[PDB]
């Protein structure tokens, strides 16, 4: 029977700027004489419907289209991709990264209590000595691995 509910404009005076949009449909005059806002000669409807049928040849098939258009410029990015999370050991001098905090040492279960917006703890003389695991939200102490 067919799907003729999908249409396209086929007339305009000029081309488009990138991602311009027009929904306004008016009787497209090539007459040079005004035609009352009514149809007829050299004033035509600017839109055209698609004539679809299941027995159409290849290329005459409905192809659903999606495009991507990205934003960067200045300001602080709002979007972000995914993230990997191997696993957390314990009691094995390790090389760790906690969402930005890069370090080395032995990780151990803690018994301190941060406030529920604090990520890591610091010592006097300003060295990172505790962190909070982002996924499970538990505090872990960071001790250096042995030297001497």
């Amino acid at each position, epitope marked *: 029977g067919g799907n003729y509910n999908y249409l396209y404009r086929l007339f305009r*005076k*000029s081309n488009l700027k990138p991602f311009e949009r027009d929904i306004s449909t008016e009787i497209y005059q090539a007459g040079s004489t005004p035609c009352n806002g009514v149809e007829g000669f050299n004033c035509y409807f600017p839109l055209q419907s698609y004539g679809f049928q299941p027995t159409n*040849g290849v290329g005459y098939q409905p192809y659903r289209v999606v495009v991507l258009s990205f934003e960067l410029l200045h300001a602080p990015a709002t979007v972000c991709g995914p993230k990997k999370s191997t696993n957390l050991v314990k009691n094995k001098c390790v090389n760790f990264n906690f969402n930005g905090l890069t370090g080395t040492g032995v990780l151990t279960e803690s018994n301190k209590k941060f406030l529920p917006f604090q990520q890591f703890g610091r010592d006097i003389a300003d060295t990172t000595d505790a962190v909070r695991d982002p996924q499970t939200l538990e505090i872990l102490d960071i001790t250096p691995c042995s030297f001497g």
Partner: antibody
Amino acid sequence: EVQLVESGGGLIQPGGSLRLSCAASGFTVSSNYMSWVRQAPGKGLEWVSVIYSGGSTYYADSVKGRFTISRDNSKNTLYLQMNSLRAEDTAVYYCARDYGDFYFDYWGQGTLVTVSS
Amino acid sequence: EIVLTQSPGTLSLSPGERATLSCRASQSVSSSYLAWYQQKPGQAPRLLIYGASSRATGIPDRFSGSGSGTDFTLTISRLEPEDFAVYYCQQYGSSPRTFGQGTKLEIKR
């Protein structure tokens, strides 16, 4: 809607160049498509080129790199400038008003393109 | 492939009778995206019918085109003698607009 007179063609030696003119009348020649079509004198009808109302042009593959179309909507005059003329492009040519589906509804009068000989 | 091929290529008849002819493609075309044309010799060729369904203005109704796919016909219901000319089929379904070669219509006085 009385329109599409043609002029300009005739005797021309090969290797030259010619701009043809098809003037129309009583019509907004800017806000539509026009086209060009040849007619070999022993053979059928073969499409040459099209313009858009936005202004985009297309050509046949044989006339690629050779033939340039243009128009002046201030004087309503289509211009077919053909260059690097070979001795097989010897047809009579027709300007044609174009609609929509690329039907050539209104037709010109014709003018002879004859290569040197 | 898109090549328009006439059925007979010429028809010599007597006026007042139903004329029928077709044009054959070289593949099945997307739906009814073709047309017909006629050519008066020494004159400009003229419109016949768009979309193989309905013809435009300036043309009376003695004429009818039908078909679907590869086959596509044209029927004139009664032979007007002054309509004797060379008649063309034209497509616009494919990415070029190809043509045929014509059909001669006349009488055998």
